[PDB]
Design an enzyme around this catalytic site. Structure first.
Site, PDB file in Angstrom:
ATOM      1  N   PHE A 172       0.883  -1.236   0.000  1.00  0.00           N
ATOM      2  CA  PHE A 172       0.000   0.000   0.000  1.00  0.00           C
ATOM      3  C   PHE A 172       0.876   1.226   0.000  1.00  0.00           C
ATOM      4  CE2 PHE A 172      -1.993   3.354   2.710  1.00  0.00           C
ATOM      5  CZ  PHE A 172      -2.871   3.797   1.769  1.00  0.00           C
ATOM      6  N   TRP A 173       1.816   1.381   0.921  1.00  0.00           N
ATOM      7  CA  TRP A 173       2.500   2.679   1.030  1.00  0.00           C
ATOM      8  C   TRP A 173       3.390   2.979  -0.183  1.00  0.00           C
ATOM      9  CZ3 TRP A 173       0.879   6.637   3.317  1.00  0.00           C
ATOM     10  CH2 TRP A 173       0.055   6.512   4.433  1.00  0.00           C
ATOM     11  N   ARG A 232      -6.068  -6.240   5.267  1.00  0.00           N
ATOM     12  CA  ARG A 232      -5.962  -5.087   4.339  1.00  0.00           C
ATOM     13  C   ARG A 232      -7.138  -4.132   4.437  1.00  0.00           C
ATOM     14  NH1 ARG A 232      -0.735  -5.353   3.802  1.00  0.00           N
ATOM     15  NH2 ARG A 232      -0.923  -3.786   2.101  1.00  0.00           N
ATOM     16  N   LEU A 233      -7.791  -4.057   5.608  1.00  0.00           N
ATOM     17  CA  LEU A 233      -8.799  -3.048   5.775  1.00  0.00           C
ATOM     18  C   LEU A 233      -8.267  -1.597   6.056  1.00  0.00           C
ATOM     19  CD1 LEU A 233     -11.876  -2.382   5.962  1.00  0.00           C
ATOM     20  CD2 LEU A 233     -11.806  -3.281   8.355  1.00  0.00           C
ATOM     21  N   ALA A 234      -7.070  -1.469   6.652  1.00  0.00           N
ATOM     22  CA  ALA A 234      -6.569  -0.122   6.956  1.00  0.00           C
ATOM     23  C   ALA A 234      -6.320   0.606   5.666  1.00  0.00           C
ATOM     24  CB  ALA A 234      -5.291  -0.165   7.827  1.00  0.00           C
ATOM     25  N   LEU A 260      -6.761   6.112  13.951  1.00  0.00           N
ATOM     26  CA  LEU A 260      -6.937   4.939  13.040  1.00  0.00           C
ATOM     27  C   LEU A 260      -7.017   3.667  13.864  1.00  0.00           C
ATOM     28  CD1 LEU A 260      -6.900   3.480  10.254  1.00  0.00           C
ATOM     29  CD2 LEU A 260      -4.398   3.497  10.394  1.00  0.00           C
ATOM     30  N   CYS A 261      -8.021   2.861  13.632  1.00  0.00           N
ATOM     31  CA  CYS A 261      -8.175   1.626  14.453  1.00  0.00           C
ATOM     32  C   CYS A 261      -8.990   0.606  13.671  1.00  0.00           C
ATOM     33  CB  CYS A 261      -8.886   1.983  15.771  1.00  0.00           C
ATOM     34  SG  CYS A 261      -9.124   0.568  16.864  1.00  0.00           S
ATOM     35  N   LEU A 298      -2.817  14.834  20.106  1.00  0.00           N
ATOM     36  CA  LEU A 298      -3.722  14.254  21.129  1.00  0.00           C
ATOM     37  C   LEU A 298      -3.856  12.768  21.111  1.00  0.00           C
ATOM     38  CD1 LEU A 298      -6.665  16.887  20.938  1.00  0.00           C
ATOM     39  CD2 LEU A 298      -4.656  16.925  22.524  1.00  0.00           C
TER      40      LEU A 298
END
Ligand SMILES: CCCCCCCCCCCCCC(=O)SCCNC(=O)CCNC(=O)[C@H](O)C(C)(C)COP(=O)(O)OP(=O)(O)OC[C@H]1O[C@@H](n2cnc3c(N)ncnc32)[C@H](O)[C@@H]1OP(=O)(O)O
Ligand SMILES: NCCCC[C@H](NC(=O)[C@H](CO)NC(=O)CCCCCCCCCO)C(=O)NCCC1CCCCC1
Ligand SMILES: [Mg+2]
Length: 411
Positions: A4-5, A169-171, A159-160, A411
């Protein structure tokens, strides 16, 4: 290495990042009208959902996802437990865009499976000082200055993916859908942080921790009685004495911040943050939002001399669940937020933060070595932990900078 990246407009290696001399975009210039108007495809058993962030059940659902599935230390001993009030604060600043909060639910039962959040931030992200000097030397000042203006960008957080859906591969799908919704509002950069190494940070620093209740920190194995203490007949009580603090603040002009302080705190903060290469620009409404006290969430004090605000500090609360201890369920942590000192040394301002946090029942005070936080580590008895925070941009080339040139608190 990165299926991905490697497809994303980010610097791909340290060597490439070492080569960057000017700030500026990475990707093809695009326009809103080029971006798909339909949501990114997702499998038929899931659905996209845009939570309403100020509505209590929707905040509760995200709260539960993060309580059970968000970041842990590397040994799976502590997991962040951001409160519902904290999440409403962090995700709804002035002029927030509801559409930048992206969730996946299972379509059948509406179970929350994944989340990512974006909020607006105005960030100074032009070429840093050391690289502007080299530019002058070479007759390249105009290209070094081209992206000096503070930019209205997206700051990503939270992100979680639920633990049952990991490594499916959902992220990447969630990150592509957030990118689409941000680009449909004519925004093309983001800033984000992570504890893990990804392609490629423009700055990295360690976490530091100031023990406030050492007996509890030792009992929950957040820290230990350090081997050096074994020369003492009574290692724990020495450790309590070591970290003891006054029962009341030492600066006589300190008080909690109130609404009428907002223009003065804006002025002194903005003037301080100009000394860093990367930092936020805040309006009066954003100072109000991020700095006025909110119980259980954010705590802000000013030093007032001759009816003028001359210094201030802020801290925010994030408890962590202690996974398995018979005496305690929760670690109560305070995190150093924005501050500015003009009348006293910084260590003397931040000692009163420690005093007030300890008085309010915090167990530890935490920070990353951004801002001038290194200037009070040793005198105030902070010690390095085992984690790091890495700073990244999406679609922005940026020369490597020291973390003490970073002024954005995340934060
Ligand atoms: C202009 C607007 C742009 C807006 C967007 C800007 C970009 C924002 C980017 C997000 C900034 C978030 C800032 C924070 O919130 S950092 C905090 C992230 N959250 C947690 O660590 C909580 C616990 N863990 C999880 O929930 C999951 O493990 C996560 C969600 C992290 C990954 O889920 P999972 O483990 O099930 O994996 P996958 O099979 O679905 O996906 C695998 C791919 O994901 C890449 N990966 C792993 N960890 C991260 C990470 N922290 N940031 C970015 N990418 C990450 C990984 O290298 C791989 O890609 P590649 O190596 O194959 O190429
Ligand atoms: N692994 C065993 C438990 C370590 C606990 C603690 N570490 C962290 O909290 C670490 C930070 O150090 N936290 C993590 O690694 C988890 C978070 C990392 C960042 C994730 C950010 C997500 C951001 C999204 O925008 C730590 O080291 N404590 C030592 C305290 C000690 C007190 C006396 C002086 C010396 C120090
Ligand atoms: Mg997955």
């Amino acid at each position: 290495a990165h299926a991905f990246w490697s497809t994303q407009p980010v610097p791909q290696t340290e060597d490439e990042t070492e080569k960057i001399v000017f700030a500026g975009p990475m990707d093809e210039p695009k326009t809103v009208a080029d971006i798909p108007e339909e949501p990114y495809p997702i499998a038929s058993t899931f659905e996209w959902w845009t939570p309403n962030m100020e509505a209590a059940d929707d905040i509760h659902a995200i709260y539960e996802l993060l309580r059970d599935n968000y970041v842990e230390d590397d040994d799976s001993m502590f997991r962040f437990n951001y409160s519902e009030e904290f999440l409403q604060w962090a995700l709804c600043p002035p002029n927030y865009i509801p559409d930048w909060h992206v969730a996946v639910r299972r379509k059948a039962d509406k179970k929350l499976l994944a989340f990512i959040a974006g909020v607006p931030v105005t960030l100074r992200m032009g070429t840093p000082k050391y690289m502007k000097v080299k530019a002058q030397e070479k007759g390249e000042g105009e290209e070094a200055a081209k992206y000096d203006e503070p930019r209205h960008i997206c700051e990503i957080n939270f992100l979680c993916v639920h633990k049952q859906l990991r490594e499916k591969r959902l992220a990447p799908i969630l990150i592509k859908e957030a990118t689409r919704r941000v680009n449909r509002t004519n925004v093309w950069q983001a800033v984000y942080t992570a504890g893990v190494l990804l392609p490629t940070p423009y700055a990295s620093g360690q976490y530091f921790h100031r023990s406030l209740n050492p007996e509890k920190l030792v009992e929950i194995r957040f820290s230990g009685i350090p081997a050096q203490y074994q020369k003492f007949q009574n290692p724990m009580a020495m450790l309590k004495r070591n970290y003891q603090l006054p029962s009341a603040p030492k600066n006589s002009g300190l008080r909690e911040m109130k609404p009428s302080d907002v223009p003065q705190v804006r002025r002194i903060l903005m003037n301080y943050l100009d000394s860093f290469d990367v930092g936020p620009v805040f309006s009066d409404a954003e100072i109000s939002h991020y700095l006025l006290p909110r119980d259980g969430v954010v705590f802000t004090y000013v030093v007032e001399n001759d009816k003028k605000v001359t210094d201030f500090f802020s801290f925010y609360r994030i408890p962590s669940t202690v996974i398995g201890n018979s005496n305690y369920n929760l670690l109560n942590a305070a995190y150093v937020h924005y501050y500015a000192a003009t009348s006293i040394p910084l260590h003397q301002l931040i000692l009163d933060l420690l005093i007030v946090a300890h008085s309010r029942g915090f167990d530890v005070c935490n920070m990353v070595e951004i801002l001038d936080n290194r200037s009070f580590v040793e005198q105030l008895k902070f010690g390095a932990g085992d984690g790091h925070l890495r700073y990244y941009f999406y679609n922005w080339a940026y020369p490597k900078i020291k973390p003490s040139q970073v002024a954005l608190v995340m934060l």
